[PDB]
Design a protein around this nucleic acid. Structure first.
Ligand SMILES: [Mg+2]
Ligand SMILES: [Mg+2]
Ligand SMILES: [Mg+2]
Ligand SMILES: [Mg+2]
Ligand SMILES: [Mg+2]
Ligand SMILES: [Mg+2]
Ligand SMILES: [Mg+2]
Ligand SMILES: [Mg+2]
Ligand SMILES: [Mg+2]
Ligand SMILES: [Mg+2]
Ligand SMILES: [Mg+2]
Ligand SMILES: [Mg+2]
Ligand SMILES: [Mg+2]
Ligand SMILES: [Mg+2]
Ligand SMILES: [Mg+2]
Ligand SMILES: [Mg+2]
Ligand SMILES: [Mg+2]
Ligand SMILES: [Zn+2]
Lengths: 147, 91, 69, 120, 52
RNA sequence: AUGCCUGGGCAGGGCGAAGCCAGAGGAAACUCUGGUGGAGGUCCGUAGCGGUCCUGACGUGCAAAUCGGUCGUCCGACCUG
RNA sequence: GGAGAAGGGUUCCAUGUGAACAGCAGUUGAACAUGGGUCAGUCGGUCCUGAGAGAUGGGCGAGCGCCGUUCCGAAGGGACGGGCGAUGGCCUCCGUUGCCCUCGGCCGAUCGAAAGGGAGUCGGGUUCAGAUCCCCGAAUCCGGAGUGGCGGAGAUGGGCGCCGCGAGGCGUCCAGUGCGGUAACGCGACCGAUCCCGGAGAAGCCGGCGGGAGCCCCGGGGAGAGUUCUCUUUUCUUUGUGAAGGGCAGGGCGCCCUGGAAUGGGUUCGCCCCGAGAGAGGGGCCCGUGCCUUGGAAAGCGUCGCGGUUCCGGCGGCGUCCGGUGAGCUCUCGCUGGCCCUUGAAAAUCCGGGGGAGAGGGUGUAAAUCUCGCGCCGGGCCGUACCCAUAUCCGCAGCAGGUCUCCAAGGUGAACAGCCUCUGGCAUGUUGGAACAAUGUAGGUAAGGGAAGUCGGCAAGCCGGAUCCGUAACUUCGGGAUAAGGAUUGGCUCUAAGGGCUGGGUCGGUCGCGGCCGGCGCCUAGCAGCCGACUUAGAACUGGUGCGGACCAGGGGAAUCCGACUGU
């Protein structure tokens, strides 16, 4: 649990295929991801939840999270608590892909940039009323001095 | 309706915050504090640890789920759609 | 400190190079044989008076056998 | 002076309605009384269970009844156990008599069947 | 009843200022400062909650 | 005055939310009774924090803002180095 | 009352004066004048990093400089293994330095906490003033240890060929970087690099329960003692053992082995657990601050009697004992839960594990010991007095103001409330004497009326605790609510109810009152003995109707307006 962030994070350990060492990354956990689960990332990675792969490979209508705005920026879009992006169409020419953001806007991105399949875990926070000034104070104490 | 008539879990809030707000938060509280059945061991020990974090006492497994419920309907629909797309693509 | 149960170990300790003044306490059936060393004060507890009197003279080098009173 | 007053209180003095400033729970909490009662009743119940006075099922039923504050003290529980044992003994005696009669009748019928087979 | 004081200049009851009562051969109660409670190593697997 | 880091502290009682047990009624849905339980930006109230009234004392004062009674709060948007 | 932090800075101690100050006085002082006093490997700074601050590289800026802390950097000067060269020391053997090859992530120099992290000391005695610092006595941590100071582990096995009655001796082949248990794991050790993994350090708030200790309480034994005009086997004080080791209680385990359970069972105050292995047996591990023992009775304390004109840290007899209890207070340890749209520190430092790059002597020896037991040497620098607050600090002052913490007895009582008392402390707060005029300031009481006073019930008064009854409109169904309104309350003498531990395996035989063997009674409707904490209810009697007798201690109801409320 990351303070100031509704969505939980997941620690994933890889192995570096250049030196004898274990690399560790802190991804944003998607719904259904559990401990002791193998997660794959690459062009040949299969279409499963919590599996990051380029948007060009994924077929149309796929729900993705932590979408890369630019190829190699390591995730910028649809990563708040439960938001997700949907791929609309693919353009083999010029290597372009259309995605629909949770705000409703449609943006054209390169097909090289990757995204994580599934929705962000922890959605539905805004449904519960705060009911108290104290709970709002505790919520905003971990973010900023703006409440 | 043993001790309270129609408040139940939101009886701790007393007369404050309004009737409709307490009624709205009642279902959220019940879902949040309920213990679910873990579909790894078969025991009813799935408990909410944090926002979107669910842990099993026996399996010691942590599952990333919804904020107030173990599974959200949107997540289930997305999982079904992803499985359908995988079957259509890989074949 | 360390307690010694065997008289042979006490005699071996009393003959150490680092051994020092060895004091004898007549504690009215709780006779003590204390040997001062660099690190520990080894104490031998003998419940028999005759054994204590016999062991009094057993010290080879003649250390400070000054009794306690 | 206070020792004499404490002895008087031990016999019971100055403890009336007009010499109590705190509530009944404040002077003696109900939770502690319930805890003592539960511990005493469960202790006696497992003494009886370990002494073969009662079996597993009677022990479990009486444990659940003790948790339901059915018995207010040790004597009531002991007398209820006596009544349960008497009723169980009567039922077991009747069942044993019926079983013996059924076994005798079945053995007689089997003997007659063997006789019929032998005579042919 | 005898009342006792801290034997050091740290007057604040912090984690490092934990004491216990002891009776000396002089028949007086003093403060003895205690070491922190240790913990057994945890398993490298990370799934077992108990300690080794 | 506000944010952050690292420490310390907050008697005794009342009301009695979930959850749980036993008994009774019902064909079921389930419903009553007696217990257990200790939740609450809950209540009385001390320490602490603050300062409503007497427009009291004092008003060349103890004091360039203090004092007495009476007061609000006192497990949290709490008080404090 | 006894001790600290910040602050003060000699205010601390001894002697002397009474010029000035301490709003009177003073033979007194925190005044004045002379001197004296602060003793550390273990107590803290010193080490680490946090929020943050701030260089280099880089950029900007007329310029002093500024921006920024990884960003526009050839950012590590370190290390092992091998080779060469040189000196030094019995150039055997080793150290050092230089060069060559080789290996190598870190993440920004540095600063940043006397309450965060951080190995390791306690007991007695001792000064006019300092003592976990001095002395005495017991320990412990870190670093060094070369020539290894010693012992012990790697260790002294088998086969073969001979000799000898045998023990045993000789020659040769080898093995030998340990051992035990099914298991958890254990045994004083028990090779090992670059590299990699993990743990500790390292975690919020609150509730409940259990264990241990300190204190309090009760029944007694001693020792010293107040009362004794009457009683009281009297009431008051004391009645113990350090750290570090060994052993044993006592707690915890989400540890293991046999086995497979519905007639579901085990179990807590509550929970909860069980074919992913519950009950029943047998083990293992962790904490053991508790008990016994070395320390350690030598010392300390209470008594009784002396040595010595004096100095004199003395000499001696005794005792320092046996038990029980408690929702009792405090500290600590351990389980179990509840809350978060709050998830509750980093680093220094230490350790374990995965691998086998390499070393060893070859059959009595060696390389190694995250060193098994001892033995030797060292631990530098700074602070240490006192006050810590109605007089040593800040407010112009000995100012009713402000200023961060620890220790926390008896009675009454729900209580750390108020009142009285013990240990400890003090003289009533910058002066005393004589009367009790008016006005005052602070407390009260008043016949009859009861707000007629006043802008206004301002002020005061009324109610007040606990037990037993009863409790409306309205409502968001949670509340209102202690609604409102009633009765009781003393003292004495009884009655009833609310619990633990042990006990029968008795007969016969056998062995030394106890143990073993066999069938008996199996208390299975339980009784006998011994203990102990407080409660609840009822009854009689009794006092000049007094009884929450002091203290503690809600005045209510019917409505209008505003703000939801808690909070500022
Ligand atoms: Mg510190
Ligand atoms: Mg005024
Ligand atoms: Mg005036
Ligand atoms: Mg004081
Ligand atoms: Mg002085
Ligand atoms: Mg004067
Ligand atoms: Mg520093
Ligand atoms: Mg079991
Ligand atoms: Mg001092
Ligand atoms: Mg004064
Ligand atoms: Mg006066
Ligand atoms: Mg005076
Ligand atoms: Mg009148
Ligand atoms: Mg008034
Ligand atoms: Mg009302
Ligand atoms: Mg109107
Ligand atoms: Mg308001
Ligand atoms: Zn599970």
């Amino acid at each position: 649990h990351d303070p100031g962030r509704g969505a939980p994070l997941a620690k994933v350990v890889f192995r570096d295929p250049y030196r004898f060492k274990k690399r560790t990354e802190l991804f944003i956990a998607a719904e259904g991801i559990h401990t002791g689960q193998f997660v794959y990332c690459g062009k040949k990675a299969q279409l499963n939840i919590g599996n990051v792969l380029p948007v060009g490979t994924m077929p149309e209508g796929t729900i993705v999270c932590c979408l890369e705005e630019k190829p190699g920026d390591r995730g910028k879009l649809a990563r708040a608590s439960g938001n997700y992006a949907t791929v609309i169409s693919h353009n083999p020419e010029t290597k372009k892909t259309r995605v629909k953001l949770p705000s409703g806007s449609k943006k054209v991105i390169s097909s090289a940039n990757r995204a994580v399949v599934g929705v962000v875990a922890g959605g539905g926070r805004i449904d519960k009323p705060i009911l108290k000034a104290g709970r709002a104070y505790h919520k905003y104490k971990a973010k900023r001095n703006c409440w | 309706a043993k001790r309270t008539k129609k408040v139940g879990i939101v009886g701790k809030y007393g007369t404050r915050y309004g009737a409709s707000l307490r009624k709205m938060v009642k279902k959220i509280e019940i879902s949040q504090h309920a213990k679910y059945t873990c579909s790894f061991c078969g025991k009813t020990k799935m408990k909410r640890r944090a926002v979107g974090i669910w842990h099993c006492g026996s399996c010691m497994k942590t599952v990333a789920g919804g904020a107030w419920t173990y599974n959200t309907t949107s997540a289930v629909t997305v999982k079904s759609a992803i499985r359908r797309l995988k079957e259509l693509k890989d074949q | 400190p360390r307690k010694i149960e065997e008289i042979k170990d006490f005699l071996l300790t009393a003959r150490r190079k680092d051994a020092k003044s060895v004091k004898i306490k007549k504690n009215k059936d709780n006779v003590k044989f204390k040997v001062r060393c660099s690190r520990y004060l080894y104490t031998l507890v003998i419940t028999d008076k005759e054994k204590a009197e016999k062991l009094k003279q057993s010290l080879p080098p003649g250390l400070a056998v000054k009794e306690l009173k | 002076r206070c020792r004499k007053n404490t002895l008087a209180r031990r016999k019971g003095r100055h403890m009336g309605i007009g010499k109590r400033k705190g509530t009944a729970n404040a002077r003696m909490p109900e939770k502690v009384t319930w805890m003592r009662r539960m511990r005493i009743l469960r202790r006696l119940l497992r003494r009886y269970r370990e002494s073969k006075k009662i079996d597993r099922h009677m022990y479990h039923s009486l444990y659940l009844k003790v948790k339901g504050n059915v018995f207010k003290n040790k004597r009531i529980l002991m007398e209820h156990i006596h009544k349960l044992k008497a009723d169980k003994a009567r039922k077991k005696l009747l069942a044993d008599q019926a079983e013996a009669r059924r076994s005798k009748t079945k053995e007689a019928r089997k003997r007659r069947e063997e006789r019929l087979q032998a005579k042919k | 009843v005898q009342r006792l004081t801290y034997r050091r200049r740290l007057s604040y009851n912090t984690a490092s200022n934990k004491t216990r009562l002891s009776r000396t051969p002089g028949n007086r109660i003093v403060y003895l400062y205690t070491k922190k409670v240790g913990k057994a190593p945890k398993s490298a697997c990370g799934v077992c909650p108990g300690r080794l």
